[PDB]
């Protein structure tokens, strides 16, 4: 739709500001290595020369420590047990994998963790026997809320010597919430308690795993057709290669840049240059992207070896230019869960504007509550609900025959694409701001809003919007490949 030279120029500019802002963040990290180390205890390792890692990101360090210690071995054991069951007892493989999932949960979280998972699953099943969507959702929400009760938290913490085990239990139960809610809502043979236990105690997704639809799980656990062993080894080899590449990329990002430590020190984030701010935002979003790429590629690889089709991994955040695409293609599993069980039951987007607003509000409110329900989470939810609603409204307005005819008559297709890129620039800026609120909280959001949109309205804002305009041209050009279908 655009000249090849023009799109090449936009791609060059996009890579340019990406890498230059990364370089600026690296320089700022080198300047304040001593201060950040004193204040946040940067870790020392030999992976990248004498560089020191930034371990201030809780999720990355938590899951890396767990994988070093126990989870990698348990995942390998699940892989081996699944292959052995396929070779020996294919018809009983779901139950062997259920048994292995329960045993691994016992190994990491002890008896209390398995007992809690079973209690939640049984309560959800019993409530689902009353085939009412409202009752099932109320039960799931109450079980989710129980995780945040101070007394329950104290009792749970008394079970484990270390805090990491308690956090692992909390994450496991948070994901089990989605899993057994999915099962119960689909329930409204093939939906019996053994199948629910197999679905819940499926190890690849036990801790932090993406929501895998029960329909696909049961359909693909009863297939009885499997790929040869050599094909499984080839798939495992390629998946491991890509996973190691992604893990190395995340470690390199944490070593070169200390985005997490800098975001922790608001006073520092308020005195860095504008290029450093942009680079910090890009590095934060891309580190989150690569982190969940690694955290879903292990479950995804295990499911692929098991013969399941896992939800698609997140798409490069440096190709996302809109709220709708961002939330369609980043967490595909959770997006599908929300579409089927939250968005559509409350009318989706087929009951006028107000219905669409209400459905989006319910979806984002549930997502924020699931993530913890903190004030910054609610803020993120409000911002993203507003962004998605505005995008849907503009899309509908343009889709009207009158507006479409006027645009075709007045503006050339190149002009239309340029206008689309200009709008997507502001959309991307707001999306980045909301996701920075998510990652760094309200202080980071206030800092970015003031230093980019208030204290730098004349030229900082226009520079950011021009760079995001080039970025959005490049993102729409790429989205033509997949977004069309």
């Amino acid at each position: 739709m655009l000249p090849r030279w023009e799109l090449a120029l936009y791609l060059l500019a996009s890579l340019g500001f990406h890498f230059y802002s990364f370089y600026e963040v690296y320089k700022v990290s080198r300047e304040h290595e001593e201060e950040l180390d004193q204040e946040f205890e940067l870790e020392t390792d030999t992976l990248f020369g004498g560089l020191k890692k930034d371990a201030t990101d809780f999720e990355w360090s938590f899951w890396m420590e767990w994988g070093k210690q126990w989870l990698v071995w348990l995942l390998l054991g699940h892989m081996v047990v699944s292959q052995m069951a396929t070779l020996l007892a294919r018809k009983h493989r779901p139950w062997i994998l259920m048994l292995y999932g329960m045993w691994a949960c016992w190994c990491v979280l002890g008896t209390p963790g398995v007992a809690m998972v079973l209690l939640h699953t049984t309560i959800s099943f019993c409530v689902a026997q009353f085939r009412s969507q409202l009752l099932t959702w109320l039960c799931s929400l109450l079980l989710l809320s129980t995780l945040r009760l101070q007394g329950v938290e104290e009792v749970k913490r008394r079970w484990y010597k270390t805090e990491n085990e308690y956090y692992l239990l909390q994450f496991t139960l948070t994901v089990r919430c989605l899993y057994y809610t999915n099962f119960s809502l689909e329930l409204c043979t093939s939906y019996s308690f053994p199948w629910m236990l197999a679905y819940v105690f499926y190890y690849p997704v036990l801790h932090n795993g993406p929501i895998l639809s029960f329909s696909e799980f049961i359909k693909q656990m009863q297939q009885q057709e499997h790929d040869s062993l050599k094909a499984s080894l080839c798939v495992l080899a390629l998946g491991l290669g890509r996973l190691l590449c992604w893990w190395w990329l995340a470690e390199l990002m944490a070593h070169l840049m200390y985005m997490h430590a800098i975001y922790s020190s608001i006073p520092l984030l308020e005195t860095v240059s504008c290029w450093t701010l942009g680079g910090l935002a890009l590095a934060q979003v891309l580190f989150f992207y690569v982190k969940y790429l690694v955290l879903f590629g292990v479950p995804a690889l295990l499911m692929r070896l098991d013969g399941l089709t896992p939800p698609a991994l997140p798409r490069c955040v440096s190709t996302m230019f809109s709220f709708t695409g961002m939330w369609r293609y980043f967490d595909v599993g959770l997006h599908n869960f929300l579409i089927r069980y939250v968005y559509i039951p409350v009318g989706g987007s087929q009951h006028g504007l107000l219905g669409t607003l209400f459905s989006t509000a319910m979806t984002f409110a549930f997502v924020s509550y699931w993530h913890g329900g903190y004030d910054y989470l609610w803020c993120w939810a409000a911002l993203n609900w507003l962004g998605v609603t505005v995008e849907n409204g503009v899309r509908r307005l343009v889709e009207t025959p009158c507006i479409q005819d006027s645009l075709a008559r007045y503006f050339s297709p190149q002009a239309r694409r340029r206008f689309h890129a200009a709008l997507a620039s502001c959309s991307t800026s707001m999306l980045i701001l909301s996701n920075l609120v998510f990652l760094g909280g309200n202080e980071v959001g206030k800092t970015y809003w003031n230093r980019i949109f208030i204290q730098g309205w004349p030229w900082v804002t226009l520079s950011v919007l021009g760079f995001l305009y080039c970025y959005s041209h490049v993102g729409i050009a790429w989205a033509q490949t997949y977004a069309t279908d």
Partner: nanobody, 122 residues
Framework: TRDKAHNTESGEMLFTVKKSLRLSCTAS????????VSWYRQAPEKPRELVAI???????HYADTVKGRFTISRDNAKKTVNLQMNSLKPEDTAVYYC??????????????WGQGTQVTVS
């Protein structure tokens, strides 16, 4: 006048010297620079209510009922949080809870509550 509420029987003018209260909350085994420390109070037969909060960026907020009277500060070096309570009134009698909580998905689900300390006045 010369009343028993004004002076002693000898004839010396009475006056009540009122003292302030300064709660403290030291955090151990944490990266104290990343927490939005806060002070809650739970008066008897009432729910716990936020008294003050100082975010990791230093931004400070106070409950409307303690604005100006109470002052909250943090010392990242000493890893302590202090609530300087002045002009105490009987309504301030409650159990005061120190709270430490990070804000932002990068920092994780760090949410810690103090055991609580009793503050009584009048």
């Amino acid at each position: 006048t010369r009343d028993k509420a004004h002076n002693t029987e000898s004839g010396e003018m009475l006056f009540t010297v009122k003292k302030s209260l300064r709660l403290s909350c030291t955090a151990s085994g944490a990266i104290f620079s990343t927490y939005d420390v806060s002070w809650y109070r739970q008066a008897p037969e009432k729910p716990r209510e936020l008294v003050a909060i100082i975010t990791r960026g230093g931004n400070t907020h106070y409950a409307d009922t303690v604005k100006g009277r109470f002052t909250i500060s943090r010392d990242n070096a000493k890893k302590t949080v202090n609530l300087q309570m002045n002009s105490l009134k009987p309504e301030d009698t409650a159990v005061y809870y120190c709270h430490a909580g990070v804000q932002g998905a990068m920092l994780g689900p760090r949410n810690y509550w103090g055991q609580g300390t009793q503050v009584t006045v009048s």
